[PDB]
Design a protein around this ligand. Structure first.
Ligand SMILES: [Pt+2]
Length: 67
């Protein structure tokens, strides 16, 4: 599935932090829209796992649904 999340990223370091947690999880194809504070993730990970992984950045995260 393709999941979209709102992630409260402020700058390049925030976008990097998101990338780092997703890279460590593995099994994800993602793209990060820093200006609009959004992250789209295609994977067979559960929405739950993806939410928890994004939250490891410490940024506020919410779920914008399936794409
Ligand atoms: Pt930042």
């Amino acid at each position: 599935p393709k999941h979209e999340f709102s992630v409260d990223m402020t700058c390049g370091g925030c976008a990097e932090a998101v990338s780092r947690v997703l890279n460590k999880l593995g099994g994800v194809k993602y793209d990060i829209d820093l200006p609009n504070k959004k992250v789209c993730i295609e994977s067979e990970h559960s929405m739950d796992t993806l939410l928890a992984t994004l939250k490891k950045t410490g940024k506020t995260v919410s779920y914008l649904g399936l794409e």
